[model samples]
Target: SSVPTKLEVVAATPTSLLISWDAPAVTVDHYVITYGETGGGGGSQEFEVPGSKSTATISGLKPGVDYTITVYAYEFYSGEYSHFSPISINYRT
Candidate 1:
């Protein structure tokens, strides 16, 4: 597996964001998308998407905050898990 490419924030509101990316060359089991307020004390929040998809929407966010978002490709095989480098972006919501 490898990192996704062209990670982008396609739309955003005070409480949500829509993101998209280009899939890597290799097949993956799923994706883990995480986001958190930049420099905030709270731990990041994450969501999962099936490998068949390339876009996702994150909601329940605070307004006017800077966030760091990362997308990771995940794989599972023989009781082991693997993840490659992630693609990340900064955005305000």
Candidate 2:
């Protein structure tokens, strides 16, 4: 299972939120991060980064908007993805 876990919020700026997490227990091809306004009708934005990278800084966020975030492991060759990590963060930036 390449499911992500142990997600953490590392830092925040006026318009960015930095996050990190432990690697998946299984081999991963890459990872995807999704975040957006908490409970807002609009869908979240997504970011894809290398599996070797465990940290991501999401920028261009609204300064005072509260958000919910999650991550999923991806194996592009297999066209597979793990179950998303629990909504990892409830953050305001």
Candidate 3:
């Protein structure tokens, strides 16, 4: 089932970026937020997050540019990860 979530581009500096999201019915044991300059990475660029609610931050990005972002909600104890997030959103500053 597709749930409702919000992706927030918190900050976009010349050399860094921070992205966040809100998951109400997270229901996952653990969460992993994976994103990259390219719309890829899958479970490669992983982040450790818990609590049904989640937030992801992608740092060290080129300034005044755009990067594809994706989030993965997974079970902590297990390795079950969620599908990729929406398409690329501009985060230039």
Candidate 4:
């Protein structure tokens, strides 16, 4: 099904975190990313990322602090339209 399969953290700055991942078997219309400190959520957002290749740099993050990140696919699916990709990345900016 069209969904997110993989999620990985690439880099981080003083106030930014860069993310990348492998595309799933099906097409993904957009991405829904959520993050915060530990079990906290830094709000949720949707981004349009096509062609299976996406490298996004999320800004406005706390500097030198660790944050838990979760990414999922927001696309057409059978049961759940939104499904989280495999992999939990730790970002510290």
- TM-score for each of the candidates: 0.90, 0.80, 0.59, 0.68
Worst 10 residues of 3 by lDDT: 84-93
Among the numbered candidates, top TM-score falls to 1
Candidate 4 wrong stretches, greater than 4 Å:
1-3, 41-53, 77-87
Compared with the true structure, all predictions reach lDDT values of 0.89, 0.78, 0.55, 0.65
Task: Rank the candidate models, highest TM-score first.
Answer: 1, 2, 4, 3
- For model 4 the TM-score comes to 0.68
Among all windows of ten consecutive residues in candidate 2, which has the lowest summed lDDT?
Answer: 78-87
Clashing pairs in 2: 63-93
Best by lDDT: 1
lDDT by residue for model 1 (33-80), tens: 999988865899999999889999999998988899999898787787
Q: Which candidate model has the greater lDDT, 1 or 4?
A: 1
Arrange candidates by lDDT, highest first: which order?
A: 1, 2, 4, 3
**lDDT value for candidate 3?**
0.55
After superposition of all CA atoms, the RMSD between model 1 and the true structure is 1.7
lDDT of 2 by residue, 1-93 (tens): 326667778898998888988877667778879898998757889988898988898988888888888787766555655544433668877
Instruction: Pick the winner on lDDT between candidates 2 and 4.
Output: 2
